[PDB]
Amino acid sequence: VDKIPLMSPCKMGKFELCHRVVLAPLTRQRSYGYIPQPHAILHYSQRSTNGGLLIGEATVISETGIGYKDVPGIWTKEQVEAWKPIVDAVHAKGGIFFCQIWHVGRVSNKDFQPNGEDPISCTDRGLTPQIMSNGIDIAHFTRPRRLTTDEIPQIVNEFRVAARNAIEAGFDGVEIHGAHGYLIDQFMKDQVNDRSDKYGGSLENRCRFALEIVEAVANEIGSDRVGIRISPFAHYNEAGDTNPTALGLYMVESLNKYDLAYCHVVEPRTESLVPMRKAYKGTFIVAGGYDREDGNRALIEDRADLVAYGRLFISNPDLPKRFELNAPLNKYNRDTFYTSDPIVGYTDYPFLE
Ligand SMILES: Cc1cc2nc3c(=O)[nH]c(=O)nc-3n(C[C@H](O)[C@H](O)[C@H](O)COP(=O)(O)O)c2cc1C
């Protein structure tokens, strides 16, 4: 089989990656009681490769960052200890593991919050109800409390502490979750951020929160161990922007000075990531609808340095290998993306026969 660009080694920060197929972050809702579980050791281990980059599922930085059931956290000593074994399994196969640190912001309900308090956000406007992945149940959200100006630095601090805890659990680095309408994207998107203080009113102001987090995290553990994910063109969670391309350009240009390990950008569903890749001086990871053919073509056209896969990695533990041999791929079952079984639809997808 002819060699392909996707299998090419890549240097990223202090890391020497052996190939460019990246495991995208994937919330699977199987971390009972918000504590990483033993079955995660196997899941991540099955997808680990020597020098392959793995980005773990969104991980909550504090009690207020919960907007879903059984997603892992990393704010307690119990959670930190539960992560170590998982981090160890990935390391045992030569993998590079980044922990994605996350806060849902207004995408939550008072029932998920400490003492039944209201979710927090850049605004005080709640989300409209959405149909849950099972097509039957409906998710309802609580109108958030608008964070005050002086409270914001305390939230930036939670990302900082989470990043430190991630390092303590053995993670190679952390990915700041700045996408999909969650807390950070809420501050960035003008359809959401109607603040009238220094954290709103302009492109620069809307991005302040995101960049303040980058700085605190980078300072806490070193920029070469930090990455960030953004989705300028995504509208998920009523978080669109009137000028996506400019929003995106602004972020990658601002991110250059931090010398991060990488910038992970989600493809638009005329919108393009070409200008962003051109503006960003570091490692560029793209994601969103890629297959073997598109992945190689993105590298050939020099649109990215790394290509992250979500859905195909869910159903193909050995995706990098399958791509390399140009082998057939298991289909993925969305019906078990978010179910809670320790094995079904989680660790029971087959390796190349
Ligand atoms: C089941 C599932 C869980 C996801 N969980 C996360 C997450 O925790 N954090 C995140 O930033 N993106 C998350 N995503 C978005 C994916 O990382 C990825 O960007 C998206 O699936 C586009 O990729 P694809 O076409 O290769 O699947 C998730 C997607 C799916 C389908």
From Swiss-Prot:
Gene Ontology MF, one: oxidoreductase activity
Catalytic residue positions: Y182 (proton donor)
Catalytic activity of the protein: (1S,2S)-OPC-8 + NADP(+) = (9S,13S,15Z)-12-oxophyto-10,15-dienoate + NADPH + H(+)
Top-level taxon of origin: Eukaryota
Location in the cell: Cytoplasm
Cofactor: FMN
Annotated tissue distribution: Constitutively expressed in roots, leaves, cotyledons, cells culture and to a lower extent in flowers.
SUPFAM superfamilies assigned: FMN-linked oxidoreductases
Amino acids binding substrate: S133, H177, G178, A179, H180, R269
Stretches that traverse the bilayer: none
Example of a GO cellular component annotation carried by this entry: cytoplasm
Induction conditions: Seems to not be influenced by wounding.
Pathway stated in the Swiss-Prot or TrEMBL entry: Lipid metabolism; oxylipin biosynthesis
Family in the record: Belongs to the NADH:flavin oxidoreductase/NADH oxidase family.
Function: Specifically cleaves olefinic bonds in alpha,beta-unsaturated carbonyls and may be involved in detoxification or modification of these reactive compounds. May be involved in the biosynthesis or metabolism of oxylipin signaling molecules. In vitro, reduces 9R,13R-12-oxophyodienoic acid (9R,13R-OPDA) to 9R,13R-OPC-8:0, but not 9S,13S-OPDA, the natural precursor of jasmonic acid. Also reduces N-ethylmaleimide and maleic acid.
Identification of the protein by name: 12-oxophytodienoate reductase 1
Organism expressing this protein natively: Solanum lycopersicum (Tomato)
Record lineage: Eukaryota, Viridiplantae, Streptophyta, Embryophyta, Tracheophyta
